């Protein structure tokens, strides 16, 4: 049913029209 409080604290709605990139092009590693 719910999570918002319990398991939904991190889980939220998705944005339509906005695209996300992968974490392999940008980011430094030592």
Curated annotation (Swiss-Prot):
It comes from the Eukaryota. This is Galanin. It comes from Homo sapiens (Human). The gene is GAL. The chain holds residues 33 to 62 of 123 of the full protein.
């Amino acid at each position: 049913g719910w999570t918002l409080n319990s398991a939904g604290y991190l889980l939220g709605p998705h944005a339509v029209g906005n695209h996300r990139s992968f974490s392999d092009k940008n980011g430094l590693t030592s």
